[PDB]
Symmetry: C3
Subunit: 228 residues, 3 copies
Amino acid sequence: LGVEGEGIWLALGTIGMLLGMLYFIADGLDVQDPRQKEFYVITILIPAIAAASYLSMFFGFGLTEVSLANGRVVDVYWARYADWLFTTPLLLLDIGLLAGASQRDIGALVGIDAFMIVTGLVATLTKVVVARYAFWTISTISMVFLLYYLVAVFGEAVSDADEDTRSTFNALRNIILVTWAIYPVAWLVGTEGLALTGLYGETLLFMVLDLVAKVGFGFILLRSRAIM
Amino acid sequence: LGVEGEGIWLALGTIGMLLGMLYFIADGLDVQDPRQKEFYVITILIPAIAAASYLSMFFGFGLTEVSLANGRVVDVYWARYADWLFTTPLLLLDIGLLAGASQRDIGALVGIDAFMIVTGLVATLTKVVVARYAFWTISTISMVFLLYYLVAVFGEAVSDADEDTRSTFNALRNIILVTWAIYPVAWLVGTEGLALTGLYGETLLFMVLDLVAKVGFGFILLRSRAIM
Amino acid sequence: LGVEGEGIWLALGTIGMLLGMLYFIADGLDVQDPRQKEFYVITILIPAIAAASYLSMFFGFGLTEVSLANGRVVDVYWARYADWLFTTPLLLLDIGLLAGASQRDIGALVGIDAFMIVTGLVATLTKVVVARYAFWTISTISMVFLLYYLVAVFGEAVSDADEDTRSTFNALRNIILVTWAIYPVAWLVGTEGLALTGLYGETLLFMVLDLVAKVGFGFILLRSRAIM
């Protein structure tokens, strides 16, 4: 399946996201409180967008070959970034609403987040080899800023909440810190960067990361006493 | 005009949207009240977007040929999706503001609207025939959910309003329910789907739907006592 | 550097935007007040986006050739419109927050701004010569509306503010009025329109405009007592 077998991870990733989406829908069917319900909506939308993106990539939509100024040909699943552009701000909105961050503070992170994803998409699409790395570098710096602000700004915001809320915040923060930081490493080691692994390995890595960052995070959030 | 004469419905769509836009601007010239003014702004912007999109299609911009795995070649007016991505959230915002729905509830419907339009663009553009129908199904599913939440959520929001506001909401709701539901049928019967009608018929049908969903909706909204 | 030497202005643009971004970051390091902080975040994000767009153009990403019905071939840097789509709304948010405009008034200007940039992108990309000038005219009309509303609506909002705030507002308003108005003239004289100057000249003109409109504007804003 796919260019070199990687479609198996695309199909698994689809099924995982859909399953996580369905569990979330079934869990929130009787929810009445408007704020609790907002966490449901956001958290159901996240794996919906990712299931759809995964499925599109399984069918070949969202996949282009890029010939670098190298002559190197790279099979670029650009549908990922489409997914990330919407799902990463939604994840930040989720944890920001948990933390009790202001509209101003969530907007700030979201802006930096969008910058991170778009400068990533440039890195991935550009044919000029130094540009690929220059943009990966720009995007990674912006992630570092984002991750610092998440800990500093949202961590302040949550400091006055109850123990359950601070505890769930810390768990969700740590899922973000560990998993999001791997993404630039995965890009670097995969076929977009140094090609230490091929498309099959790279696809498997992002499948696992996306599943943790979306369904794993969602699980932890929606089961917390904090949101109830 | 166009690939097979369909440019005539593109010119008429352009002129219809423009005339609606002009009517609404001339009708709003003396408006002082901020809330009333916001309905004018939203409701002018909608046919402005659609006139600009129709005109772009009339000139051939936003038209691509797509060769399906079928061998079938489909003439895809993709600029319709660009238009819809922004006008369908704006329509929902308009009806939401009338209903007195919360920021949470409006945002929720916009989310799922975006999901419907984007998955509909994938359906239209993918070459894999099973994928085209798969995405059309996904999108239709999301449409049903949206229409349900419109009736239930926005309908509950409007239930404490005055009689004029309730009656206008029901009129506008019923315009959306009938008109919006026809769009997936139009895709299925038109050249992107089963090709029971060709490009000229399909273009005629979207022109009529669009004029009703935007200018007809706008007319009913802006002439109501509810917004005054 | 570039197709016809214009790389020099792409590089210089990158550097000036980056330096403006670093001066603003340095300047806001001790800032504690939330509303003052917000002005820093928006004003640092603007030249960040613009520096990245310039660097992308310097490396040739965001450059297509368009063959017009004319036989004319035009080297179109489309990465500019990506940049503008985000930076012009942010510029409007920055001045609306200074003016104390409502969320409804800011959103209204952003909507017509988006319309202006997107119709300009169509003008730039369309192969049909009459459509180029039709969209340029659409876009310019929308710009005039936007500039009038900026004067009238934000001007009214700021009229109850302190004298420092009114004075800064008038400064920033006058930068937008003068500099923004030049953009459509620059499009018309340059390679996209009448070709009175070539790509090199056009790229120089946009570089100066962008620098004034972003770093010059930010400088005036961030140094004002009005935000302190």
